[PDB]
Design a binder for this molecule. Sequence first.
Ligand SMILES: *C/C=C(C)/C=C/C=C(C)/C=C/C1=C(C)CCCC1(C)C
Ligand SMILES: CCCCCCCC/C=C\CCCCCCCC(=O)O
Ligand SMILES: CCCCCCCC/C=C\CCCCCCCC(=O)O
Ligand SMILES: [Cl-]
Ligand SMILES: [Cl-]
Length: 264
Amino acid sequence: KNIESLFDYSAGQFEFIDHLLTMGVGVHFAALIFFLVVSQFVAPKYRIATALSCIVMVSAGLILNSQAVMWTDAYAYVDGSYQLQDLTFSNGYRYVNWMATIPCLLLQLLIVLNLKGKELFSTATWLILAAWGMIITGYVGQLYEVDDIAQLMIWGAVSTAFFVVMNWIVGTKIFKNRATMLGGTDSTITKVFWLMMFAWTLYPIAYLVPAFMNNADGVVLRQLLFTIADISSKVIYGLMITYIAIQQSAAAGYVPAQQALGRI
Ligand SMILES: *C/C=C(C)/C=C/C=C(C)/C=C/C1=C(C)CCCC1(C)C
Ligand SMILES: CCCCCCCC/C=C\CCCCCCCC(=O)O
Ligand SMILES: CCCCCCCC/C=C\CCCCCCCC(=O)O
Ligand SMILES: [Cl-]
Ligand SMILES: [Cl-]
């Protein structure tokens, strides 16, 4: 059902995708240790934001590791190329994982924006429903990326409408609550918004590769785009969130955060 199953791969293509996925595992688990160790410098009111980064690192790291092993299970070197065997490889497992990781990425943003109480709960609910609508309609669309490109496009348009509305909610909350943020992080948080807009827009570009580059090099490109996007949207983003959490912690008087920042 997916374009990966259509092609034999050169050794260079096959090895490069394997190395991409494996490097992605290493980066996420390396970053996990960082977020774990610095969580003791985050004030209680923000510490869940850094815990969420830990959860996202393991969740994303496990899906990338599962994809890497599925890639090597599915293909074997036969008659000079990597050819599909009895098991298949597909990107559908990424979509299922996004059902958990996208809410985690959004929730840590809302925590450092200082939303609390009812506004936090209600903003998180609408965001998570919009994200789940995006993910589910995209998952259906990519079931047709070989059989029915028209259908891929239409479900992709519906998914993109949820994406746009979600981003509208996020941006409205950022620009509305910028003013509450401590330690100069009202300037930082706007950069986080732009980082999200850039990095999350790479996923719909990967989703469209079947329409514009249906060949083995398009398969490689899609995994390359996922890799750039994953590291940007989860690791670099989490580092910025953690920086904002620690900076606001210090400005609110949390002594471990003041001492951590002073040490650098
Ligand atoms: C770490 C994973 C992240 C940040 C996943 C982000 C996924 C998206 C923003 C998916 C977006 C889509 C569209 C906007 C339309 C095409 C179908 C999707 C689901 C790929
Ligand atoms: C900011 C996140 C960066 C993600 C790092 C991804 C690493 C990509 C490295 C450079 C790509 C150049 C490699 C050449 C690909 C050869 C294709 C082939 O083997 O046929
Ligand atoms: C086994 C896979 C091979 C690749 C292993 C990767 C080794 C880790 C390298 C750096 C990962 C980038 C994340 C950096 C952690 C945050 C620390 C910081 O920059 O302040
Ligand atoms: Cl606190
Ligand atoms: Cl993920």
